[PDB]
């Protein structure tokens, strides 16, 4: 899997491939790896599909119950709940999650939670098997306070390379835009991104 979240001027954008593999066989070629835990807090799932789904489901439950009592939770609060599950059950979980959310005070924020259960707040995060091939590219090309069109291109070009080199990654490039304006879903097909 190839997943990334990038902070920009107006908020944050989540990007992912659509390929789920068992061995060398593609079980699902149109997977949605970008999942909603709250209205403007989303996550990118990588690793066990059973685990990443089970974790995401519990967090959505916790943040729904949080909202009932204490109103809208921060992106940091969501990442803390993810960390708590991942860290305390590190022996029984294979899950690399990127948490991304839009507050009105804090704007766009990105937290990455690797296998360990550690939390890392970053301007942008890349994860999954495909990520290895685009560390060089992403580091050289990422700038802070990019525009929406710049950030969409940055994610599209990055995941395009990840997909090209990683057998485990492929299909469509899904993206989810988190800004004050609201939530926008974007899709990009092979015929576009392959020939970038």
């Amino acid at each position: 899997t190839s997943i990334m979240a990038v902070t920009f001027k107006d908020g944050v954008i989540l990007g992912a491939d659509s390929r789920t593999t068992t061995g060398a066989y593609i079980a699902n070629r149109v997977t949605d790896k970008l999942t909603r835990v709250h209205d403007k807090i989303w996550c990118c799932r990588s690793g066990s599909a059973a685990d990443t789904q089970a974790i995401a489901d519990i967090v959505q439950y916790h943040l729904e119950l949080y909202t009932s009592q204490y109103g809208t939770p921060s992106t940091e609060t969501a990442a803390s709940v993810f960390k708590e599950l991942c860290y305390e059950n590190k022996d029984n979980l294979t899950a690399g999650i990127i948490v991304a959310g839009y507050d009105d005070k804090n704007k766009g924020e990105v937290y990455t939670i690797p296998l360990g259960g550690s939390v890392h707040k970053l301007p942008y995060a890349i994860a999954g098997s495909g990520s290895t091939f685009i560390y060089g590219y992403c580091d050289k090309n990422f700038r802070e306070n990019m525009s929406k069109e710049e950030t969409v291109d940055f994610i599209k070009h990055s995941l395009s390379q990840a997909i090209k080199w990683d057998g485990s990654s492929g299909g469509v490039i899904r993206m989810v835009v988190l800004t004050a304006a609201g939530v926008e879903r974007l899709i990009f097909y092979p015929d576009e991104y392959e020939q970038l």
Partner: peptide, 4 residues
Amino acid sequence: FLWX
């Protein structure tokens, strides 16, 4: 088993 499925991976991502």
